[model samples]
Target: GAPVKLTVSQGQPVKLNCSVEGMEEPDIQWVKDGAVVQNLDQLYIPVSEQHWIGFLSLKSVERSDAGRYWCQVEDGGETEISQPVWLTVEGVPFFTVEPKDLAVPPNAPFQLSCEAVGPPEPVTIVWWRGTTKIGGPAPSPSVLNVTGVTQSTMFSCEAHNLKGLASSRTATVHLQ
Candidate 1:
């Protein structure tokens, strides 16, 4: 059989299961990314007379939790590793550099920048002027070059990905 795959959104909880049967005495442990997980809290469940299942729970998962995981069992000094369970955590893009308020001369050119980080990558950026959407979605860490400024207004930027979208702080454009 193939390995187990778990895909979940960021900040969500996860539970993984591993089962063992026909063992007089068994020692079970969870391994993540080739490192043995310590201080593991296991939930034991009995299915049949001889079958036993162990569950590993994650309170809240982050992007760093995405990796290969499995259950390792030791019976009388013999070791066995169960099938791998791959975890994937998806999250919305977060802004790094948001547009800032600036003062510029009337009819003068200006520029604004927006940047974000995403795991479900290909994050896109979009500029906003007041209540209207400016240009289409562009790649993350994008810049908007204004040819000329006219009246004073507000500008903001937003970043989006497959997971969700994140809005940036609004910036004011003042004419001097």
Candidate 2:
């Protein structure tokens, strides 16, 4: 039998469905990464009072949840392991803050910053002025500083990775 393919988004809820046939009231168990998943909530098998099959369901998936999973069934003197299944999680970049809007006095220095937290370290942060790229492609904690402001300034920050990008709060400074 071909392996099952499961895909999920990071921080999102997901369910793994396992079903087995060909046994009289089969005893089913779930395993992950070569080890048994250690909780009743992580494993489930619903067998009707007169049914001969079993089903398993997993909910609320995470990146660590991605791995080799399988089901084992036993009935009478026979035992069987279902085909191994693989799970892949797609992570989306998360931002610490949304674009901010601010007002500052004229002829004063202003600062803008952006940061993100994720599994892959060394994330790249960038600063943007409208559609123009101003600063960064730098690691976390990217900042932009401007001094002696004399006019209206609008700026935004962006954080990105090999997978996706997230923008930060936009800030505006108006010199008096």
Candidate 3:
């Protein structure tokens, strides 16, 4: 009863595998929501209590590991808990749809957007006349179109993955 998610700029690596079948050397533990994840060496690695199946590794992840995870087993004496698994850690580049605030007229016809997310994807969203950066760097696409619109203009959007850059909120095109 577990399956959620992972990824990083988030350093991108997270696993929580817990197995308990007929039990044999089971005494696994991985908790977070009840808080109790023993990172035995700094990212925890458990794969052989003998082997009834076990796994929990995080090579790199932050944002407090994303939340909700459970696996507590104590075979024979009878102890089982595993029915909650979720660890969604995106890899940076965040701008979940920003850049809106318009009142266009003068040069009319405009379309500007900003929406970026990451799990180590190809997030490269950018636009600016609110001007933070316009050339010599990179990022443009993911939906961007600008028209004449002379005077009173402001456009902004920024997103880049690999764990860097994220911005929005500046879409002013009031030209009347």
Number of colliding residue pairs in each model = 0, 7, 2
TM-score of each: 0.61, 0.51, 0.36
RMSD values, in order shown = 4.8, 7.7, 10.5
Backbone steric clashes in candidate 1, count: 0
RMSD of 3: 10.5
Error of 3 at 164 (Å): 1.7
Return the lDDT, model 2, position 3: 84
Model 3 TM-score, 2 decimals: 0.36
Q: Model 2's lDDT to the true fold? A: 0.65
Q: List the residue pairs that clash in candidate 1.
A: none
Give the whole-model CA lDDT for all candidates, comma-separated: 0.80, 0.65, 0.64
In model 2, the worst 10-residue window by lDDT is: 48-57
Candidate 2 on 60-110: residue-level lDDT in tens?
Answer: 666677787777654534434457778776564556654455566766766
Q: Flag regions of model 2 displaced more than 4 Å.
A: 1-7, 10-13, 16-43, 46-90, 97-100
